Ligand binder design. Structure first.
Ligand SMILES: NC(=O)c1ccc[n+]([C@@H]2O[C@H](COP(=O)([O-])OP(=O)(O)OC[C@H]3O[C@@H](n4cnc5c(N)ncnc54)[C@H](O)[C@@H]3O)[C@@H](O)[C@H]2O)c1
Ligand SMILES: NC(=O)c1ccc[n+]([C@@H]2O[C@H](COP(=O)([O-])OP(=O)(O)OC[C@H]3O[C@@H](n4cnc5c(N)ncnc54)[C@H](O)[C@@H]3O)[C@@H](O)[C@H]2O)c1
Ligand SMILES: NC(=O)c1ccc[n+]([C@@H]2O[C@H](COP(=O)([O-])OP(=O)(O)OC[C@H]3O[C@@H](n4cnc5c(N)ncnc54)[C@H](O)[C@@H]3O)[C@@H](O)[C@H]2O)c1
Ligand SMILES: NC(=O)c1ccc[n+]([C@@H]2O[C@H](COP(=O)([O-])OP(=O)(O)OC[C@H]3O[C@@H](n4cnc5c(N)ncnc54)[C@H](O)[C@@H]3O)[C@@H](O)[C@H]2O)c1
Ligand SMILES: [Zn+2]
Ligand SMILES: [Zn+2]
Ligand SMILES: [Zn+2]
Ligand SMILES: [Zn+2]
Ligand SMILES: [Zn+2]
Ligand SMILES: [Zn+2]
Ligand SMILES: [Zn+2]
Ligand SMILES: [Zn+2]
Lengths: 251, 251, 251, 251
């Protein structure tokens, strides 16, 4: 019976067509947020809109690329058309190449930084302005455990996720006076359909052993924390990094 | 319309007769937790129980001193009698002497460590064992911003609050396999009745300036995060430190 | 009488022609490292080489832009020609524009990320491989206090400095077996001659008040910590972030 | 050829009769500090003084218990008799019972807190006052990796080491104006004689795999960082926590 104070407003969820973003969109919509599901994949975004509406909520899809700053502007316009924009979850991200720093391709490095960091900044610019103009709101940036610790052969990803904590702190300091809160969420390894499909039984067991709870997280377990932080109940929470990692970083 | 998945279980709230503890007790009870309100002050604990019952919730008072290990045992037994113990909020605490490290009195130092650290540990022993035996639960330790930064003339307090992050990490690692989660909450300065009553209009303005949001927090703004973290929605959150500080530690 | 175990090897210092980089180059060279001073400013780079040689040390200048990956490769080749490359200090950096996240120039953002983050990665690729090939070494990345806290109107800078902590962690994990250590240094505000010329009296006084020591740091006070971490004395120090901040982040 | 700017002053090293404390005493004395080696074990302290004097240095032994506040006062007086007290290394510590938080001995908990936390505070009171009177100095508190992460079945130890980071921050803030710096060092697992004696080959191999460098640290590798932080070269380093952990906390 979990319910969040996220009604009478619109919410952008970037990369909302799949995995954690999908879970976030469904949880926000279930508590009455009018959710704009943005994604590269138009049909995936539309499927989540349809699921939302089969469960009785409000949502719309917008297909595009968050690395285009024009798209973040179009997303803020499309969200505001549904209801006043007071939530943005900058969740779209990619894993990058699996290689050492020394071997890493320049193209892969630049692509991971562009999506996982620069596109969050691009999206935030219109999000911050819209929320400041309409009395306040919450931006939740999807970081990772890998925003605070490393993981061999994923340096670009780790670097970008670290970067998000600083961007989060700065926007929080700058827009607090406008009652725009900005926070970062740090999930541990989450069992998405893609992760499940990629991991060998042995590789899965290895990752499970790195979490004190002895399992990977579920997308719904991240979505709950995101929905709480985006809600009016979290009105004194800003600038901060919130782990949902099953104890990964506690050792 | 915030509701938390904390029903069909008992919750201990230490120091539940005043301030943050009172707000925590009211929030947990309003979502269906059977709350044991524990406090040195019997009449204050009884007053909170009366408020909970008038609002349609279930609670009971138990008066005593958390620095007596026997009292933490008695609290766990009394809570279990209401419903299976699956939440404990170790919130009781004192501000301590205002003095430099060099001037700090030994008894004053020892008293702050005894209440703000050792009593949390004393309570956790029977809490952890009870929750492990009945299939899992959540312990929320009330730390502070001063668990991660300092504040001149409050060294014993700062020291105790830093200590809680380690006790929290360790219990989380040790009882994760039993599905007992242990987390720490770090509020900024909160406008409890005693904070209000202490601060001159000038000293209040000074502290407000140290929070990006330009105000002190409200007890209910801490209680919301505590209730979320103590609930089934927080099932992948353990070992971690969660700031509710209006941006205090982001600069 | 401070002396560092940095002899019989070469050291790259990027941005070594002025400010903190100059102080690092002078300190390393005075303890026997053969220092390759790299800088956009060829006159400054040659001037620091002349200072080093006047004090009886060994150095050479290479003028160029760290944002060109080919220049980092050329820097490693030129350093290896002096003596085996076992130290690299990725110090070159820019402040970026002063603006809110919402107003921030896209080009200024991208330029700050490019110099302060991507160029460190570009340089690290050949540095890591050279040091792994010759039995180990130390890479010191120049971060900031602003790698762990924010500062209003310098979001791009804060973001890039945060990113460096992750890049540092990851390279440390990946090259530990090759005995290549990678660390980050986090200075507070440092009164370089350039800063002393730029800051108004009022701006300087404001910043001094944010440091417990009540002053800005000296470039030599950063250089000493860099020289220590780059030395054989620091053989068990890797992956970590080391503040030299006069107490800035302790509150 | 490493040398530290620690001459023309006295240095207290608590627990200096063995392991890391012994290495710290030897390294400080070799760079000209007059070292007061304090320890429960008078003969062990005397043996370290004998080694120091054989190597050409100045030292004296003082046997006592750091949990007696009168002993820390006596230690400051004895150090000042050699030369002006400007270094204190609060290194004395014990391990504690190996048990879960739920099973933990109240006696063991209180003993670990008393030595590893309260005695550091007890010694710091006269240390801070003496150094303030002498024109400044440095206090290095021996924390651990376990001041920032947990380790199952060592909760009291982990809790005490976390506490030290707060005590360090607060003393740094309060005595910065007197030029007394206060820092914490966080070693990974170190091959002291008692670690090598107590760990099975299998337990040692397990811990080696938790450090990126694939080995435990040596006492001399902690002593170099302590000596640096205690020296005039570290004059802008205060309030901060410095890991010497072979990458342990970077993942
Ligand atoms: N183990 C995990 O899954 C895990 C753990 C911690 C953090 N995260 C973070 O959570 C977020 C979501 O991860 P996920 O596992 O659900 O991934 P996913 O691949 O299942 O979903 C990501 C979605 O983002 C979209 N997307 C990617 N690039 C885009 C772009 N340029 N423009 C618009 N949409 C774009 C994709 O189309 C996809 O639908 C990411 O930021 C990821 O880094 C994931
Ligand atoms: N600004 C703030 O108020 C603030 C900020 C951060 C953290 N905290 C933490 O919040 C917690 C609650 O503080 P508060 O501000 O609500 O204070 P408060 O004084 O309003 O309430 C504290 C309660 O704890 C009880 N208590 C004290 N010692 C006890 C003992 N030995 N045994 C049993 N009960 C005892 C008191 O009787 C009182 O009812 C404390 O741990 C405090 O450190 C407070
Ligand atoms: N307050 C401070 O000064 C302070 C505090 C903390 C961190 N830092 C960091 O220390 C480092 C040095 O700062 P500083 O104050 O000495 O700066 P500075 O501007 O005085 O010197 C920087 C040097 O780097 C060179 N440089 C800049 N971009 C370059 C490029 N693309 N290629 C090659 N050389 C380039 C410049 O020519 C110059 O000689 C930077 O990373 C900065 O972020 C500075
Ligand atoms: N793996 C490690 O060895 C390791 C790692 C991180 C931190 N540390 C810390 O390093 C410090 C030194 O530990 P060590 O490994 O060298 O231990 P050790 O047992 O070799 O030496 C500790 C010394 O402290 C003395 N001592 C203990 N209690 C005392 C008291 N009450 N009064 C006076 N002297 C007392 C002992 O007599 C002994 O000589 C401790 O704080 C420990 O927690 C050790
Ligand atoms: Zn009474
Ligand atoms: Zn009363
Ligand atoms: Zn000057
Ligand atoms: Zn701060
Ligand atoms: Zn004896
Ligand atoms: Zn003996
Ligand atoms: Zn050995
Ligand atoms: Zn870890």
């Amino acid at each position: 019976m979990a319910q969040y104070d996220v009604a009478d407003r619109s919410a952008i969820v970037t990369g909302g067509g799949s995995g954690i973003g999908r879970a976030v969109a469904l949880t926000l919509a279930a508590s009455g947020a009018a959710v704009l599901v943005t994604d590269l994949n138009e049909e995936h975004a539309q499927a989540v809109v349809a699921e939302i509406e089969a469960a009785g909520g409000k949502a719309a899809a917008l297909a595009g690329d968050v690395t285009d700053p024009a798209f973040g502007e179009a997303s803020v316009a499309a969200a505001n058309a549904l209801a006043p924009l007071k939530i943005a979850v900058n969740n779209a991200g990619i894993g990058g190449e699996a290689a050492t720093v020394g071997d890493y391709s320049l193209d892969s490095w630049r692509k991971v930084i562009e999506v996982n960091l620069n596109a969050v900044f691009y999206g935030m610019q219109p999000q911050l302005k819209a929320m400041a103009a309409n009395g306040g709101g919450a931006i939740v940036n999807m970081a990772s455990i890998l925003g605070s610790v490393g993981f061999a052969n994923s340096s670009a990803y780790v670097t970008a996720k670290h970067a998000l904590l600083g961007l989060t702190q700065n926007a929080a300091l700058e827009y607090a006076a406008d009652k725009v809160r900005v926070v970062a969420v740090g999930p541990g390894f989450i069992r998405t359909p893609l992760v499940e499909a990629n991991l060998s039984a042995e590789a899965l067991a290895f990752l499970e052993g790195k979490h004190a709870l002895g399992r990977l997280g579920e997308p719904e377990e991240v979505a709950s924390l995101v929905a709480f932080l985006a809600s009016d109940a979290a009105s004194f929470i800003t600038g901060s990094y919130h782990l949902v990692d099953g104890g990964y970083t506690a050792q």
